[PDB]
């Protein structure tokens, strides 16, 4: 499993329910034209494999601007972390060290 | 210089090369029929004068739909910001304050 194959959220119903369904969650809010998002892709693939207990999903902010707005997403990439059926926090930007640290705390 | 005299992007490779060459880049994605793009022209002229260390260009989304598509532009004006050889952010709509604040941070 990798950045390429993880679920991409395309609607609010899916977004909300998948949060509720998961004990540990990372949502990568991204834009396809955005260089820091692209930079983070191989880092996410490594994290996806290193933390198989964590569900990673992704969301294209131009394709799903209603989901991005629900999470009040401004900067790309924004990683929104979920824990026990609930969103708990953000890691903003192409920062693999801070991102891995937040994931380890889940 | 001004809105009228800045480079008008016409090609996808040209757009990519400009992104790589420029430490600081603003692209105005506009449509000629769209009033808010017109309203933003004198604001862009002021910003172009105020930020000589920023390269400003423009792109007609209807004449260059592939470049608009690359940046996922469907609302105009959209201002796409690049820093140090990659695209980093997008400001959507006729919002002079938000635009300057983004430009100021480059």
Task: Determine the Cα–Cα distance for residues A75 and B71; give it in Å rounded to an integer.
Answer: 15
Residue B2 phi/psi, 5-degree rounding, is -145, 175
This entry's atomic model was obtained through: X-ray
Question: Which DSSP helix (H) or strand (E) runs through B77?
Answer: none
Task: Determine the Cα–Cα distance for residues A52 and B68; give it in Å rounded to an integer.
Answer: 37
Burial B42-59 (b: 16+ CB within 10 A, else e): ebbbebbeebeebbbbbb
CA quadruple B59, B61, B64, B70: dihedral sign: positive
Task: Determine the Cα–Cα distance for residues B39 and B36; give it in Å rounded to an integer.
Answer: 5
A25 touches A7 (CB < 8 A)? no
Cβ neighbours around A67 below 10 Å, total: 21
Sequence length of chain A is 106
Cβ neighbours around A105 below 10 Å, total: 11
Task: Determine the Cα–Cα distance for residues A51 and B6; give it in Å rounded to an integer.
Answer: 48
Gap between the terminal Cα atoms of chain B: 20
Within its chain, how far is the Cα of B96 from the centroid?
Answer: 13
The DSSP letter of residue B8 is B
- Comparing C-alpha atoms, which of A79, A81, A77, A95 is closest to residue A38? A77
Which residue is listed with tokens 């889940």?
A106
* Boundaries of every domain in chain B: 1-106
Q: What CATH superfamily is the domain A1-106?
A: Glutaredoxin (3.40.30.10)
In chain A, the residue whose alpha carbon lies closest to the alpha carbon of B78 is A62
Task: Determine the Cα–Cα distance for residues A41 and B93; give it in Å rounded to an integer.
Answer: 29
In chain B, the residue whose alpha carbon lies closest to the alpha carbon of A60 is B72
CA quadruple A56, A13, A65, A67: dihedral sign: negative
Q: Which of residues 14-73 of B touch A (CB under 8 A)?
A: 70-72
């Amino acid at each position: 499993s990798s950045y390429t194959s993880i679920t991409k959220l395309t609607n609010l119903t899916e977004f909300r329910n998948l949060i509720k369904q998961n004990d540990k969650l990372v949502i990568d809010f991204y834009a396809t034209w955005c260089g820091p998002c692209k930079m983070m892709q191989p880092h996410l693939t490594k994290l996806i494999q290193a933390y198989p207990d964590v569900r990673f999903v992704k969301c294209d902010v131009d394709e799903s601007p209603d989901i991005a707005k629900e999470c009040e997403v401004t900067a790309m990439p924004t990683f929104v972390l979920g824990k026990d059926g609930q969103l708990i926090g953000k890691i903003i930007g192409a920062n693999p060290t801070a991102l891995e640290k937040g994931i380890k705390d889940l």
